[PDB]
Design a protein around this ligand. Structure first.
Ligand code: ZN
Lengths: 397, 49, 397, 397
């Protein structure tokens, strides 16, 4: 594996620093490294493919070095080089792709392909270098057994979940009390509704609560918390819990009362915020708990009083809500987020080559399914597969 | 007391130079850079080409 | 052009690696490269500016070299250097800006300024080095003709479009059926409404469809798809299609039925998702087609039944919708997105110097106008201009 | 300060470029730099911690150097090295953290800890190297005195503010006119409402205006401007200005008329856009002014006419709005944004070690409080503290 990495920063820091002009002395430390490779290779036979729509191309080697020592790089030098790189490019592609489709439960955090199983070989180890690519940096630290770490803008930690829970309901669904929400990606919106506007509730206050359990701990999270759930602020006709009928939701929004957000880790409160809207920091948590209340307005102008009668029918449904968005965070496990193309790269290569569903990943690399049952095997395979996608993107986008 | 390896050499590259990125000691160390990378200053005009 | 690049990584990898302290050896390979430049320069004169509110300044070159003589850089070494760099800084700025304004149809792609037309000259090429800046990496590969590629976040592919289409309407606008939408940036929200709640529709289901044609293909897109269009979930008074009057929209939202999203490429379905909300991957497409239906609820509680009578007036308007957001994607053509400052840099320099409208770009570099008619000439000019902005941002932000 | 930096790119460009395999000529320029350090160190005693729940550890040195012989790196070489790096890692951590807590007031922009006050010492300066980390790049340019600058995605310039202003009101709150808004982070949503639908207004048009003053100038901003304020498009029961009662808001949305956005700098209009929705560029501004109007529809279908009677009660409240989002921008001062983890890192280290509230920063490093009163002292301390967080993240995430 680490092998693989080099093969690239080799080419990038190559197809990039090697252009008509520059002095030799700008690549002395580079040229060398390069050659070293060619040698180790020359002679060894290879094969890639054998699955779905993936060609089976063979690769033979027999190349010379670069002794042409001329102060300044003359055009002629480049072309005689680019022609030798374009075989490694078109190669690596066919290499990444081959080990980017095979999966394994007996452990996938390891080489699978007849291409790579031969790379981890010892005689090839003579190649590694410049591991400043965020992903490899993390691959190593892991295979040595120690704390990892990655960066994400609008991470994708919440499997899609859009539902409701009726805490008080009746057949006619004309006097309900409960919550409805949408957990998806890095965002949570939750609304608490009480058709009776807490008319018979103790202290004329109805308590609500929404708990979300992350499948992985997030640390150093920058979060936006805002009152109101716009998504649940409009009239809706919804299916009943049993699917037998439909109910009507006609919200009128009030400010959430006694808002308390707790970011817990293993049941312990790590961060707690009382009615603080705007930007807040949650430094380490595996659970978010949002508690908020609907308090019947003690003083009401006529127009307001008219919405909340002492007796049914209750036609305007008092609703309070919250919106929470994780802008950025760090996770010790790889995850999809709103900026990185890893998930999309892996998913795209598999789709393009009609790769059959395997034993580890859900059909279509479905994110919701993956994060919902994020087993150790799926994570090890995902990390291997994400790290390869990142190696590939250094050369092929 | 730096022997250990009476220094093995094989031609090509700069056998003096290499001593620079070798042992440490400042006094010793400046000599090396000043002598090693010390060249001639290519100067033109001097009251006529 | 490639010339230009170097001039910078030269200075950055310079104004950065050269300070009171460092040991020679980390810059030996660097110092060299540097000097080489100075030489090639000295003697030549340049013409920068001469348009709008742009200062016309002349530049002569006659500077010394470097003291490879010392061991560990002494403060005195720096200052005598920084003073020589600050002429190149204040220079390049005046250089970028000059070619970041001119445009031409026929040969729009190539260099235009009396400053750059002289740089592409041959006697200069002796300068290139370390081309790892994502943008140049892509400039080159393009002059050779290959699968280029750029990375974005909330890309800006959709020209602003906010409108509606009434499939069934009448003068009173009291029983309409159609769709309304907002396509902007990387997001699409579309709602289908049927004032009659499919009372007389076959199978009591009204079909809707929204098609969006991208001006450029997007590959490896990570997309969020959610049911409902919040933007079209509230009461509105809208202008009629002919502008002669205004109609009333009073939505009540139902779940979109039989949702199907197709990402097509040249008329072919590349990806298709049936009712899958959350995160989905669209690997290569130039068109998005969203199909969804409003199905009259077969079972209704009294409160719901009351909203949907058998006869007009129809006072609650059944509405179903979808929201789609492209979080990230790759495009072979440069585009504006939510993270890169290129468009803003180019637009800002032109605005600050009162640069007159030219023959290629729309007034004010207006994004909507640009992407709506993204001609080859506009793209070549945009890429040239974006690449220069990126070269400039390595030194001046 | 600059000292500190090196200590890291030293280790990263180390724990990265030094693995089982690579040839010597890939790091010759590197090894050297490294050793140089060791020397300067060994012999000097350090001390860290002491405040709050932060341990107090002592450090001593007399570590060996590194063989500059072997051509290929043998495993044995690595391990005898990693063991020496893991003391510097676990060290630096304890170093950053120590100076990432103390605060001054005047001259609070400089070093504070008994650990760092000794680093700025002269005998240590012999270490600086490769300053290509966006943040240090900017620290230096500032020390000397120049035009700094950083890159932000969805920046955090607006302190949280959610309120309203009633321009026409009466006890019953049955015929109000005014605006309500939410300024938070990089977004502004503002709605103008007129319960009377401009029935008695000159030209049947009610003018609205929303002004937002940034605490710091933003340059090169890419902004999304859209009509409508979804957040204020639904029914609400709101507390009166004096908190004595609650009023009812029942909006019906109309298109904002004569929209004009001005981005001003010191009272001068730098950019102005008339009714342009989509993506716009604001190149340099410290104030945003949004002006928009509600114009009573001159022609109304019956359904619309019914919402707007000539006499009270006014039951449908005409509302027009705007949404503005700063996707990206450059600021000369450090700020929190939606991608960088700096604020979260600083806030997290302080929270984890129970660091007492100091004289500079608001309790909990509260962003809203910080940006609301962004004094020079808070900014200098924030920059110092953010730069240290960035140095730390090169090694520890
Ligand atoms: Zn974003």
């Amino acid at each position: 594996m680490d092998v693989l990495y080099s093969l690239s920063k080799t080419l990038k820091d190559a197809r990039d620093k090697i252009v008509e002009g520059t002095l030799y002395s700008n690549v002395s430390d580079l040229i060398q490294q390069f050659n070293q490779m060619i040698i180790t290779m020359n002679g060894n036979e290879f094969q890639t493919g054998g699955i779905g729509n993936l060609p089976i191309r063979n690769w033979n080697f027999d190349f010379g070095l670069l002794g042409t020592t001329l102060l300044n790089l003359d055009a002629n030098y480049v072309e005689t080089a680019r022609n030798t790189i374009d075989y490694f490019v078109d190669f690596v592609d066919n290499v990444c792709m081959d080990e980017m489709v095979r999966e394994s439960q007996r452990n996938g955090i390891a080489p699978q392909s007849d291409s790579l199983r031969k790379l981890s070989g010892l005689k090839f180890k003579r190649i590694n270098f410049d591991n400043s690519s965020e992903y490899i940096e993390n691959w190593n630290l892991q295979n040595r057994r120690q704390r990892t770490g990655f960066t994400f803008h609008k991470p994708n930690i919440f499997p899609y979940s859009a539902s409701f829970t009726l805490n008080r309901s009746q057949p006619a669904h004309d006097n309900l009390m409960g919550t409805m929400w949408l957990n998806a990606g890095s965002e949570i919106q939750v609304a608490g509704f009480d058709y009776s506007c807490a008319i018979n509730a103790p202290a004329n206050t109805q308590q609500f609560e929404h708990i979300v359990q992350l499948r992985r701990v997030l640390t150093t999270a920058t979060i936006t918390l805002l009152p109101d759930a716009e998504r649940f602020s409009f009239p809706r006709v919804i299916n009943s819990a049993d699917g037998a009928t439909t109910w009507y939701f006609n919200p009128v929004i009030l400010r959430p009362n006694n808002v308390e957000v707790e970011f817990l880790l293993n049941g312990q409160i790590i961060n707690t915020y009382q009615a603080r809207f705007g930007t807040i920091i949650a430094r380490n948590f595996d659970t978010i708990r949002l508690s908020f209340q609907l308090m019947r307005p003690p003083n009401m102008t006529p127009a307001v009083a008219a919405l909340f009668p002492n007796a049914q029918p209750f036609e305007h449904h008092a609703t309070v809500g919250l919106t929470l968005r994780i802008e950025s965070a760090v996770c010790e496990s790889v995850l999809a987020d709103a900026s990185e193309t890893m998930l999309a790269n892996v998913t795209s290569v598999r789709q393009e080559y009609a790769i059959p569903v395997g034993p580890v990943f859900p059909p279509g690399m479905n994110w919701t399914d993956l994060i919902t049952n994020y087993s150790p095997s799926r994570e090890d395979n995902l990390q291997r597969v994400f790290t390869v996608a990142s190696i590939r993107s250094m050369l092929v986008k | 007391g730096m022997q250990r390896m009476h220094y093995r050499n094989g031609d090509p590259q700069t056998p003096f130079q290499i001593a620079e990125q070798q042992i440490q000691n400042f006094q010793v160390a400046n000599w090396l850079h000043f002598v090693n990378n010390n060249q001639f200053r290519q100067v033109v005009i001097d009251g006529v080409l």
